Amino acid sequence: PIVVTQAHIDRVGIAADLLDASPVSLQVLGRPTAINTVVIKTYIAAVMELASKQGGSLAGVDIRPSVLLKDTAIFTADVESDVDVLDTGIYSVPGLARKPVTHRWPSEGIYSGVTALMGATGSGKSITLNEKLRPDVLIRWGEVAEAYDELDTAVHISTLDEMLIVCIGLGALGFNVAVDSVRPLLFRLKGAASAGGIVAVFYSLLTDISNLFTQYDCSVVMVVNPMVDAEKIEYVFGQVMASTVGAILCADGNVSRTMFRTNKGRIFN
Amino acid sequence: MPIVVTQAHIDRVGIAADLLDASPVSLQVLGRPTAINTVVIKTYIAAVMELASKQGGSLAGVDIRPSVLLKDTAIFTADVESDVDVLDTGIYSVPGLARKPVTHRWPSEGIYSGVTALMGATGSGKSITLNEKLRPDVLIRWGEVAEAYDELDTAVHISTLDEMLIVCIGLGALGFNVAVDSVRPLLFRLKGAASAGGIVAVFYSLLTDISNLFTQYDCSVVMVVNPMVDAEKIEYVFGQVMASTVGAILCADGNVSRTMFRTNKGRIFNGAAPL
Amino acid sequence: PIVVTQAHIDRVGIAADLLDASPVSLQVLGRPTAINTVVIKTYIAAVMELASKQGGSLAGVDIRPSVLLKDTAIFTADVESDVDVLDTGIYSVPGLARKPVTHRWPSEGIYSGVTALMGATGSGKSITLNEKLRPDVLIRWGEVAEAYDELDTAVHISTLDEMLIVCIGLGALGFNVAVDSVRPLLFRLKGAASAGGIVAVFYSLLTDISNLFTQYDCSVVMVVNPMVDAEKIEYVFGQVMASTVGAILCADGNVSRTMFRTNKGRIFN
Amino acid sequence: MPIVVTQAHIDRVGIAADLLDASPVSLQVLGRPTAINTVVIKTYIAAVMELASKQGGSLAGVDIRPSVLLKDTAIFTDVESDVDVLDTGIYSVPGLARKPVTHRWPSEGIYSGVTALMGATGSGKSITLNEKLRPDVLIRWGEVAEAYDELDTAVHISTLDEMLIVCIGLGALGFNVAVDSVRPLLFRLKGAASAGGIVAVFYSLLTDISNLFTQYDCSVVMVVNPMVDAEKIEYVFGQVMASTVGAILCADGNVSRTMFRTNKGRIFN
Amino acid sequence: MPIVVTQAHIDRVGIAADLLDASPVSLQVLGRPTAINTVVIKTYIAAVMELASKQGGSLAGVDIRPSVLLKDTAIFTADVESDVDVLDTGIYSVPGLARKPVTHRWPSEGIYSGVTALMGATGSGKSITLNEKLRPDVLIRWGEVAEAYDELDTAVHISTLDEMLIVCIGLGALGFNVAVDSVRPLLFRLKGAASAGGIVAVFYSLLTDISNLFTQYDCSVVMVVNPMVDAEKIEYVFGQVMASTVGAILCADGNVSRTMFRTNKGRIFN
Amino acid sequence: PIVVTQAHIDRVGIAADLLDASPVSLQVLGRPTAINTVVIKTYIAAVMELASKQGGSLAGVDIRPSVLLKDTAIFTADVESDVDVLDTGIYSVPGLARKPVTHRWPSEGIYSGVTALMGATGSGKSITLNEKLRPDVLIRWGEVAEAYDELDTAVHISTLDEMLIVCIGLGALGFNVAVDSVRPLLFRLKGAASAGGIVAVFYSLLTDISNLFTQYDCSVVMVVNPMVDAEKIEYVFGQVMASTVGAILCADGNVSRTMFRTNKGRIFN
Ligand SMILES: Nc1ncnc2c1ncn2[C@@H]1O[C@H](COP(=O)(O)OP(=O)(O)O)[C@@H](O)[C@H]1O
Ligand SMILES: Nc1ncnc2c1ncn2[C@@H]1O[C@H](COP(=O)(O)OP(=O)(O)O)[C@@H](O)[C@H]1O
Ligand SMILES: Nc1ncnc2c1ncn2[C@@H]1O[C@H](COP(=O)(O)OP(=O)(O)O)[C@@H](O)[C@H]1O
Ligand SMILES: Nc1ncnc2c1ncn2[C@@H]1O[C@H](COP(=O)(O)OP(=O)(O)O)[C@@H](O)[C@H]1O
Ligand SMILES: Nc1ncnc2c1ncn2[C@@H]1O[C@H](COP(=O)(O)OP(=O)(O)O)[C@@H](O)[C@H]1O
Ligand SMILES: Nc1ncnc2c1ncn2[C@@H]1O[C@H](COP(=O)(O)OP(=O)(O)O)[C@@H](O)[C@H]1O
Ligand SMILES: [Ca+2]
Ligand SMILES: [Ca+2]
Ligand SMILES: [Ca+2]
Ligand SMILES: [Ca+2]
Ligand SMILES: [Ca+2]
Ligand SMILES: [Ca+2]
């Protein structure tokens, strides 16, 4: 189940302070788009109210944003992916001047941010995620019908707005949030593929997503499976390590390589 | 050759209407998420049942084509380019099922509701395997040249993607074993930059979105997917398709080279089961 | 000459019925465009009236649509080849539920549809067509001045609309229509080249053209010459076999391979 | 060096006007078909004859340039190169149903149309043209300052409209017109390169240009030098032979291969 | 860790304002040339000096971020595509200096004003070399994940390209040793057809335009440049970057592989 | 210094004449754009007045167009580089019917036009330019801070308009003008790369620039260093020789190959 501890209730105020304190945006190949912080706060309030009506034990089905919120929009006419960078400007989510909040998951003493669970198709990413990682909240998005969908920890979303709402909203409260998968975004990345058979803005997006979680004290594990050649996966994994707080590589059902940025330092395997 | 409507199908009509009304769905490709008008599918089911009633249960595939039964065949309800910022359009994937999906005996025993993808190079024996080994109840024929399968009473000739989804969701929800030969009109018009495997990445997302659309409406559909891909990259593309569908079949030299089915007994790779 | 028999005159009514019975469209990389059936009927009536001015014998020059019709348009603001496929929709010309009408040309018992005469430049396609196939009507499009242009069977067109008018119009009446060449269309096909150095929509167009002829009981032979590498022609020919009712490959002035879908079944060489 | 107007040229003026008025023509590349204003070519012929009358018939190439004789040099009366082929339509200039008028230049008994003077850079194309071919009128387009520019046969143009005006205008009258070179058109041909490292519409354009000259009884030699690999030139030359009435290949200052479509048939070397 | 304002910096304030007003500048990429609003940089300098006055000259990088000091962070003053005719937009390159550039002691002795590119593969030791071996006065952090360098009092966290240029031109002109870790948010968003070396040609033009912008405002800036390039193609790109920057440093296996600096004693290669 | 001789003063009238006599344009992948000749004349007049105020000895800094002219625009809504060639038309600057004016620089008896100083990065182009070629006026564009910027011959420009103003303006008067570099124009050439890893319109632009100088009796040396592979430079230099009046190849700090079109003929090394 998804259980709401006193620790989560005590974080509600802090989560609001974090969201209000820093105005954030996101950019991909178009123009920077602001994130409406209010929506995330509204989601937290709705989750806590429902957790209250229950015995602290919540069902992932009941906490999906489409059910709790009237509108699921986070981003507040239309720009092409091939527009001059000087006409749109460039935005990256700012870093944290203070020391980031540490976590015990996915690794001991890991800083707040994003962890990328990498590997070829059928390498055992989903298996590693649910058996070895054991997340508190499992966001299921753009994945086919599996055994993980019947889990009470599973929260089924449709949009990128919904993913960020659940990730920032619940992650800030202290929950160990995971996403299986981020394929709907990755498989719709438009642009000229750079070195490694993948668009360069992919690495910028991982950093922007990681810093978004670092700023809101979230520890999120994302399954990242982009369309890349069997031999080019090693290069891409190395590049992703330079763009995320955590990185896990899967091969033949087992964990091939690891990287975690902890309070004890950067740890490689 | 005929399409027979059992009491089991008649009893599913209400259930199907509820499934459609219960969840609002959309679809996206490289542009803006587009809503699916559920009403049209319900209207199609009502028209099929009414005609099944006039005839003696038994129906001809020719008579159940949407262009004949419905005044308008539109399912999707100004114009966006395939190269527009992903943040200005947002991203949509059809949501998964929180409950256990309805199991089926076709195309494999104890299979979950969703989509099965019948892969293979040209002349690998996809259409042969589909009609001889699989034996579907309803055969949707789309963007295929004149073959023996067109003279079959199970054959329903469509022209649009809207029509394909109407027949697939409409009849599939009622319990019919629906098949699509081919899905090529869609595949050959996929605009975008080709990813690893000489095919657009959104192709795999579309298969998952189509699979979940059928999982939500308790459909068991087999779609024959013919990719414009090099002889050596077909193995990679299949491996990728397996991770995007409830069922996958590879064809090579008139036979079935590889299979994958997500059953109630678990995920089965290359089983000892004749189709 | 192009001789009009009583058999052709008796088909006029049936041709009009076939055209009115089914509304058709066509699509390439843009949006589906409807085919104005009326124009084809008007062309048939004009050919029959001229046939009547002569002794049933017609000169190919006199039956060109630009001469017989006030407007040659068949397709009834502007869409790019890289627009969302969900905004335009997808269209394929529907198949025939009934048995297709059989023909004696280009092969015995062949079903109505299209035959693709393939081969490298100077492989003998035009020679094979005019000497071995010997068509009743020879549509000449996008080909330089040759001996075939002085033939009374030759009808010189300029547009794709004109090609379909003569192909559907005369083909429905029972004439053995041939197109040399379909290069104006092929060489202007915009889009990213798929496996085999050719746009994938090329194979969809051949199927849509074939089914358009199957629906109107036409037996047409089109010279399909692709800008493809000398060794990649075998792959493309195999791909075309899956998209047409007939397929003929030319090499060194001789017929290399054949494929025909007949009443006796699919025949390979 | 001078351009002399014979009685034979004066007697062709009426016929030339009759050929231009008889058939309405257009041209297409990757966009939409654009009509050719025939009147402008007639106006040019009348201006050349009027000047030939004032002088002794001995005209200077400098004095017969369209920019000097005509107030407006436009022959064609905004669409992207990546637009749906069904929204623009397809156009190819129609073939001649009658036998084409034969010429003694560039080869004996050659049919009216276009001849492509091919070869690598510095293979001796310009040398072969002026020394071995000896053209009556030498159109100079997109070429650096050479000895051929000081010639009284040289007519310096700037636009494609001007090229067609001088080619059709003077060529119809019986003059042996040559173009060195067609490089500004070829190097501005936008689109995805097909087999041989060159856009497929290049071969369609050569056929459309050839048929335009076949219809107006012109015998034109165009030096065609597209950006192609040193070893891929043999493939491209073979493909061009299937798209033109004449084809000449240059290597090490000499003529490597030749192809001409004559009244005695197609002659290869 | 702190950012100290010397009398030398205070004496440069007037000169900096003169340099900015004297020459109107612009920037171009694949679109149309866009003017740089000089006033914003002057306003930033005034805000930094006023805060340095309230403190004891000792400033925290966090307090000097433009988003905190300025109401509006825009430097560039409807929308053009990256594939538009070059003749319809025109071409702009920031002009060179007719006079001798103002030399510095950092990143190398007697190096002319401009930009230095800190190159290398991912995890080659660029960030390590920057903070340990280079020791910058001001460390601009942009498009980089949470690291130890973010807790430094020299660290100034930006979000936009406008902010980067404000801090680089503003503080660099006063004489500060400014560094950017990194410029990945601009590089990874560079739209266009990749030229020889698996990278867009306008990348080299941008480095020269950025270099000259610093040369004109007597700025000594070190930018870590890490574009998506193949493991073996990095040598070619580094050689090409040397022809586009005043300084160039290559990193390999945590150490400095190669160097290039344009100094008063001449161009020095390793 | 930049010294103004009586020979330069005597050319002022001839320069205005040459400029008024022929209206010119320029085209790249868009539409042809006219060059305002008046601006070049205005620049010449401002340079001569300043030369007359000073001792004839000028400073490159004082003759920059941005300082002498109120507006630096030469070209007089927005077209994409992928637009139909038939909708924009094609323009090439016309050739000279008369003999081009000869020069003693960069080679003896060389015709007026452009010389391309080619080579890989650090091949010695800028060293060869300033030590071996010794230009009168040195235009500095798109280059980092070097020793050449402190020179009194150096004139710092920002736009393509400014480059043409100084090149045509001072070049017509008899000055030996050089551009280091033309990289801001080369590196911003949008379009599909042809054979040799470079856009085909690059060669057309060199010919158009050369002919622009041939028409205005200029002798200009431009260092041309486009992004091309280390082994593909030989092919490109070969194509450039067919597009310019002069061509110099640099390697290992010295001159590898040369080509000059002189009054004594074309000289190769
Ligand atoms: N092609 C295959 N053949 C056999 N077993 C496979 C195949 N693909 C996947 N599997 C099995 O599935 C497991 C991986 O499951 P899963 O976690 O869902 O992979 P992923 O999330 O990386 O796509 C493997 O460890 C293996 O047991
Ligand atoms: N090139 C060929 N030569 C011979 N037989 C062929 C050829 N292509 C296909 N076939 C035959 O057709 C069968 C496949 O038919 P079909 O099911 O329609 O293929 P698909 O649907 O995959 O295109 C093969 O098993 C074989 O008997
Ligand atoms: N380059 C060539 N050299 C010699 N003969 C050739 C050449 N190209 C074609 N031919 C001749 O022309 C014949 C083919 O003519 P044709 O039917 O017009 O070819 P296609 O229509 O395929 O282009 C060949 O069989 C051969 O006799
Ligand atoms: N790189 C070169 N080295 C030596 N001679 C050359 C070179 N390029 C051209 N030539 C000379 O120029 C002649 C070709 O001149 P030209 O007719 O103008 O060629 P093209 O028009 O094909 O470019 C050759 O026969 C040769 O004598
Ligand atoms: N894949 C790796 N395996 C082991 N150590 C690594 C790896 N990647 C980076 N490192 C360590 O990190 C150091 C580089 O850190 P850093 O300066 O942040 O690199 P960069 O800024 O170039 O990405 C290396 O010297 C090494 O000690
Ligand atoms: N990578 C390098 N390593 C060493 N010296 C170099 C390098 N690149 C250039 N040089 C030096 O600079 C000289 C070339 O200078 P320059 O003319 O400015 O080059 P460019 O051709 O880029 O204009 C060479 O002769 C050599 O002394
Ligand atoms: Ca998975
Ligand atoms: Ca089939
Ligand atoms: Ca032929
Ligand atoms: Ca030449
Ligand atoms: Ca770093
Ligand atoms: Ca240099």
Rounded CA-CA distance D39/D168 in Å is 12
Strands E138-141 and C102-103, sheet pairing: unpaired
Name chain A's partners: 3 or more CB pairs within 8 A: B, E
Rounded CA-CA distance A74/A209 in Å is 14
Q: Give the domain range for residue A219.
A: 22-269
Bridge partner list, F58? F2
Rounded CA-CA distance D120/D227 in Å is 9
Q: Alpha carbon E99 to chain centroid distance? A: 21
Q: Are C199 and D82 in contact (CB under 8 A)?
A: no
DSSP state of F3: E
Rounded CA-CA distance D182/F90 in Å is 11
Q: What are the structure tokens assigned to C264, written together?
A: 């006796």
Rounded CA-CA distance A183/A223 in Å is 8
User: Residue E91 falls within a domain, yes or no?
Assistant: yes
> Which residue's CA is the closest to the ligand 5 atom numbered 27?
E254
Contacts of A196 in chain E (CB under 8 A): 228
Contacts of D204 in chain C (CB under 8 A): 142, 183-184, 187-188
Bridge partner list, A254? A251
User: Residue C2 falls within a domain, yes or no?
Assistant: no
Contacts 24+ apart (CB under 8 A), E229-232: E229/A195, E229/E197, E229/E198, E229/E199, E230/A195, E230/E198, E231/A235, E231/E121
| Ligand index nearest the alpha carbon of residue D180 | 10
Mutate-to-test residue for ligand 3 from C117, C118, C125, highest number of ligand atoms within 8 A of CB: C125
Query: In 3D, which of D214, D236, D212, D242 has the Cα closest to residue D224?
Result: D236
CB contact under 8 A, F144 and E80: no
Angstrom CA distances, B52 to B55, B219, F187, stand at: 5, 20, 68
Residue B88 DSSP SS3? helix
Strands B247-252 and B114-120, sheet pairing: parallel
Measured from the Cα of D250, ligand 4's closest atom is 22
Angstrom CA distances, F254 to C227, F129, F239, F250, stand at: 44, 11, 21, 6
Helix (H) or strand (E) holding E171, with range, is helix E161-173
Q: Are C121 and C252 in contact (CB under 8 A)?
A: no
How many C-beta atoms lie closer than 10 Å to residue D105's C-beta?
A: 18
User: Residue E65 falls within a domain, yes or no?
Assistant: yes
> Which residue's CA is the closest to the ligand 6 atom numbered 14?
F124
Strands C137-140 and B155-157, sheet pairing: unpaired
Q: What are the structure tokens assigned to D125, written together?
A: 């194309």
Rounded CA-CA distance F116/F237 in Å is 9
F124 CB under 6 A from ligand 6? yes
Single-letter code of the amino acid located at B235 = E
- The verdict on whether residue D125 carries a ligand-binding annotation is yes
Q: What are the structure tokens assigned to A52, written together?
A: 């209250």
What residues have CB less than 8 Å from E198, skipping those under 6 apart?
A194, A195, E228, E229, E230, E233
Bridge partner list, F154? F138
Rounded CA-CA distance B140/B118 in Å is 14
Rounded CA-CA distance F161/F72 in Å is 7
Whether the bond into D53 is cis, omega within 30 of 0: no
Burial class (CB in 10 A: 0-12, 13-18, 19+), B150: buried
| Minimal CA separation from A89 to chain E, in Å | 7
Give the one of E190, E192, E228 whose C-beta lies nearest to A196's C-beta.
E228
What residues have CB less than 8 Å from F38, skipping those under 6 apart?
none
- The verdict on whether residue C56 carries a ligand-binding annotation is no
What residues have CB less than 8 Å from D239, skipping those under 6 apart?
C121, C227, D196, D203
Bridge partner list, A193? A199
Q: Are A222 and A70 in contact (CB under 8 A)?
A: no
Query: In 3D, which of A28, A55, A58, A33 has the Cα closest to residue A43?
Result: A58
Q: Measure the CA angle with vertex E193, ends A25 and C229; round to 5°.
A: 135
Instruction: Quickly count helices (H) and strands (E) in chain B.
Output: 9, 12
- The verdict on whether residue E125 carries a ligand-binding annotation is yes
Measured from the Cα of F250, ligand 6's closest atom is 21
Buried-state track B20-31, b at ≥16 Cβ within 10 A, e below 16: beeeebbbbbbb
User: Residue E131 falls within a domain, yes or no?
Assistant: yes
Q: Which CATH number do you get for residue D81?
A: 3.40.50.300
Residue F265 DSSP SS3? strand
Phi, psi of E137 (to 5 degrees): -70, -45
Distance from Cα A122 to the centre of ligand 7, integer Å: 7
Query: In 3D, which of B71, E187, B159 has the Cα closest to residue A85?
Result: E187
Rounded CA-CA distance C93/B143 in Å is 7
A145 CB under 6 A from ligand 1? no
Angstrom CA distances, F230 to C177, E201, E241, F121, F197, stand at: 55, 15, 15, 10, 11
Q: What are the structure tokens assigned to D169, written together?
A: 């205008």
DSSP state of C94: P
Q: Alpha carbon B17 to chain centroid distance? A: 19
Instruction: Quickly count helices (H) and strands (E) in chain D.
Output: 9, 14
Rounded CA-CA distance E184/C160 in Å is 50
What residues have CB less than 8 Å from C65, skipping those under 6 apart?
C43, C72, C157, C161, C162, C165, C166
H runs (alpha helix) in B55-199:
66-69, 86-89, 126-128, 161-173, 184-187
Rounded CA-CA distance A110/E70 in Å is 35
Q: Are C168 and C218 in contact (CB under 8 A)?
A: yes
Top residue of E82, E91, E112 to mutate, by most chain F CBs within 10 Å, is E91
Measured from the Cα of F253, ligand 6's closest atom is 25
User: Residue B229 falls within a domain, yes or no?
Assistant: yes
Contacts of B198 in chain C (CB under 8 A): 194-195
- Ligand 3 surroundings by CB, under 6 angstroms: C 119, 121-127, 250, 253; D 238, 241-242, 268
How many C-beta atoms lie closer than 10 Å to residue F77's C-beta?
A: 3
Phi, psi of B267 (to 5 degrees): -75, 115
E244 CB under 6 A from ligand 5? no
CB contact under 8 A, D184 and F86: no
User: Residue C14 falls within a domain, yes or no?
Assistant: no
Q: Measure the CA angle with vertex C41, ends C35 and C47; round to 5°.
A: 130
A119 CB under 6 A from ligand 1? yes
Rounded CA-CA distance D162/E121 in Å is 54
H runs (alpha helix) in B113-155:
126-128
Q: Are C90 and B139 in contact (CB under 8 A)?
A: no
Rounded CA-CA distance F254/E27 in Å is 34
Does chain D touch chain B (at least 3 C-beta pairs within 8 Å)? Answer: no
DSSP state of F158: -
Top residue of C26, C92, C235 to mutate, by most chain B CBs within 10 Å, is C92
| Minimal CA separation from B198 to chain C, in Å | 7
Rounded CA-CA distance B75/B40 in Å is 6
| Ligand index nearest the alpha carbon of residue B254 | 2
Helix (H) or strand (E) holding F152, with range, is none
Name the closest residue on chain E to residue A203, using Cα atoms: E188
Which residue reads 């005369």 in tokens?
C170
Q: What are the structure tokens assigned to C43, written together?
A: 């062309």
Rounded CA-CA distance E55/E5 in Å is 10
User: Please, how many CA atoms are within 13 Å of residue B267, restricted to the half-sphere of its CB?
Assistant: 12
- The verdict on whether residue C262 carries a ligand-binding annotation is no
Q: What are the structure tokens assigned to A47, written together?
A: 């989750």
Q: Tell me how far apart the 2 most distant CA atoms of chain E are, in Å.
A: 53
Number of domains in chain B: 1
Whether the bond into E53 is cis, omega within 30 of 0: no
Rounded CA-CA distance A137/A117 in Å is 16
User: Residue E13 falls within a domain, yes or no?
Assistant: no
> Which residue's CA is the closest to the ligand 2 atom numbered 12?
B123
User: Residue A16 falls within a domain, yes or no?
Assistant: no
Overall residue count recorded for chain C in this entry: 269
Q: Are D121 and F242 in contact (CB under 8 A)?
A: yes
Query: In 3D, which of E193, B4, D161, E251 has the Cα closest to residue F187?
Result: E193
Q: What are the structure tokens assigned to F165, written together?
A: 């103003």
How many C-beta atoms lie closer than 10 Å to residue F57's C-beta?
A: 11
CB contact under 8 A, E91 and F191: no
Q: Are D198 and D233 in contact (CB under 8 A)?
A: no
| Minimal CA separation from C218 to chain B, in Å | 13
H runs (alpha helix) in chain A:
6-21, 37-53, 65-68, 85-88, 125-127, 160-172, 183-186, 201-215, 233-241
Signed CA dihedral, B63, B68, B72, B74: sign only: positive
How many C-beta atoms lie closer than 10 Å to residue D7's C-beta?
A: 8
CB contact under 8 A, E93 and F191: no
Rounded CA-CA distance A14/E32 in Å is 45
Contacts of F95 in chain D (CB under 8 A): 140, 143, 145, 149, 154, 156
Rounded CA-CA distance D45/D26 in Å is 20
Q: Are E109 and E195 in contact (CB under 8 A)?
A: no
Phi, psi of D222 (to 5 degrees): -110, 130
Give the one of A27, A86, A238 whose C-beta lies nearest to E29's C-beta.
A86
Residue B182 DSSP SS3? coil
CB contact under 8 A, A183 and B202: no
Which residue reads 């654009």 in tokens?
D34
Helix (H) or strand (E) holding A227, with range, is none
Distance from Cα D262 to the centre of ligand 9, integer Å: 16
